[PDB]
């Protein structure tokens, strides 16, 4: 109310409204899902168009050969943050000949988002991210919130109506975590997960976006006729 003019102000109950308003931009975003087994990690994203004459806004971005993310909210902010991750992954490779641990990737995003919540003039990032990767400790899934909070999960979803997929994955937990050495089945589970968040619209060929990374699979994105297999 009187305490939402900027990020540098606490409300009387200890809230940061600018950060909460940034969180709200994610809620308006198109649904995206993340889930993993012990061998692979999979992103599934519902893409959104302006109208029938426009393209469908790309939701998934590659960060390295072993890492990448999906976005929900302000897309330019995802471009800034993904670019930062690309550099951090890159620095680790050039200087230490070391693939950046997905966990460190999370810590780095947390700290970058945090600085924008304590200084005057700045604003919080207005995007949520789901980071998947395969590193020296196996497959991983992370959830990034622009409050700075990063969380490691077996599965999750962010965006409008993400609660449907998040409930489904919570039920399916014991099944999909043991889909080891089978990419097409882990994707099927993710495609069924994102279906619990659809209303009046169904998954089409220029609507669905799937990404996968794992033990013997570089981070690769599927669009167009390559996702027809899964509808």
């Amino acid at each position: 109310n009187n305490y939402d003019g900027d990020t540098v102000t606490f409300s009387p109950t200890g809230r940061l409204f600018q950060v909460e308003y940034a969180l709200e931009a994610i809620k308006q975003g198109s649904v995206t899902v993340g889930l993993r087994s012990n061998t692979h990690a999979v992103l599934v994203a519902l893409k959104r168009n302006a109208d029938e004459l426009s393209s469908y806004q790309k939701k998934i971005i590659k960060c390295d050969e072993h890492m990448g993310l999906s976005l929900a909210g302000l897309a330019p902010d995802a471009r800034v943050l993904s670019n930062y991750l690309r550099q951090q992954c890159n620095y680790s490779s050039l200087v230490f000949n070391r693939k950046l641990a997905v966990e460190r990737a999370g810590h780095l995003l947390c700290d970058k988002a945090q600085k924008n919540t304590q200084s005057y003039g700045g604003r919080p990032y207005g995007v949520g991210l789901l980071i998947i990767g395969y590193d020296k400790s196996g497959a991983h899934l992370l959830e990034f919130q622009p409050s700075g909070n990063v969380t490691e999960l077996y599965g999750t979803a962010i965006g409008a109506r993400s609660q449907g997929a998040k409930t489904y994955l919570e039920r399916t937990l014991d099944t999909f975590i043991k889909i080891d050495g089978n990419p097409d089945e882990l994707i099927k589970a993710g495609v069924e997960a994102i279906s619990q968040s659809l209303r009046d619209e169904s998954l089409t060929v220029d609507n669905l976006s799937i990404a996968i990374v794992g033990k013997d699979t570089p981070f690769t994105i599927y669009d167009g006729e390559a996702v027809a297999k899964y509808i």
């Binding site: 102000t9 409300s11 200890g14 947390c110 490691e152």
Partner: protein, 243 residues
């Protein structure tokens, strides 16, 4: 009025309302504690399990500074990470110039001055965390608790978060019942009990326990996480006491 709209402004009382508002963010956070013992310190924290989908043991909240200091905090988690990052920078520059690892009182003032600095200007926000931290140096064990204002003291026991009062009461009993001192292994068990007892004030979601310790005899003066057999033993001791 309007005295509460800007950091670093004195109210007619002589108070900085923005700091007091940051304290509200801390009171909203989960419970974390510190127990000082014979030759070290023990840290424990409540991790609310929001969903089945959280990977157990894999969202670590206790943080190490240098190789001998442990830090835990309640409130805005990102703010706590910022403070630890600074703590690590301070500790590195102390070790660079003076060779010896940073003493705990020295480290306490480094964090204190840095947090106090975020109450001096209207262009920054106060920290939304109270931080319990400590370790072992050349003069033995030290436990500290630092608040958003920059205020810190040495503690026999310390608690912050939603279950702070419950935990404080439990801490005071230990201080009264053990005037000679508590052992490191005993303090680990007690930490588990107190977190379980302090969980009553946050009992909707069930939780995951996380413990760490520094002890001159048990961990050789270095910070280590309590895992496996020692953790399950501490969990069981706590489970027996609530029933």
């Amino acid at each position: 009025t309007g005295y509460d709209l800007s950091n670093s402004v004195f109210s007619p009382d002589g108070r900085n309302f923005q700091v007091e508002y940051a304290v509200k963010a801390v009171e909203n956070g989960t419970t974390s504690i510190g127990i000082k013992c014979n030759d070290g310190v023990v840290f424990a924290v409540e991790k609310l399990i929001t969903s089945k989908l959280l990977v157990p043991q894999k969202n670590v909240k206790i943080q190490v500074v240098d190789r001998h200091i442990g830090c835990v905090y309640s409130g805005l988690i990102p703010d706590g990470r910022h403070l630890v990052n600074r703590g690590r920078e301070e500790a590195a520059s102390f070790k660079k110039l003076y060779k010896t690892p940073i003493p705990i009182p020295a480290f306490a003032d480094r964090l204190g001055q840095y947090v106090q600095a975020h109450t001096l200007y209207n262009s920054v926000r106060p920290f939304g965390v109270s931080t319990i931290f400590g370790g072992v140096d050349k003069n033995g064990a030290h436990l500290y608790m630092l608040e958003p204002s920059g205020s810190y003291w040495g503690y026999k026991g310390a608690a912050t978060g939603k279950g702070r009062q419950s935990a404080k009461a439990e801490l005071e009993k230990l201080v009264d019942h053990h005037p000679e001192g508590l052992s490191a292994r005993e303090a680990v068990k007690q930490a588990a009990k107190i977190i379980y007892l302090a969980h009553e004030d946050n009992k909707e979601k069930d939780f995951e326990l996380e413990i760490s310790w520094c002890s001159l005899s048990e961990t050789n003066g270095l910070h280590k996480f309590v895992k496996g057999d020692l953790l399950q033993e501490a969990i069981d001791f706590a489970q027996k006491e609530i029933n």
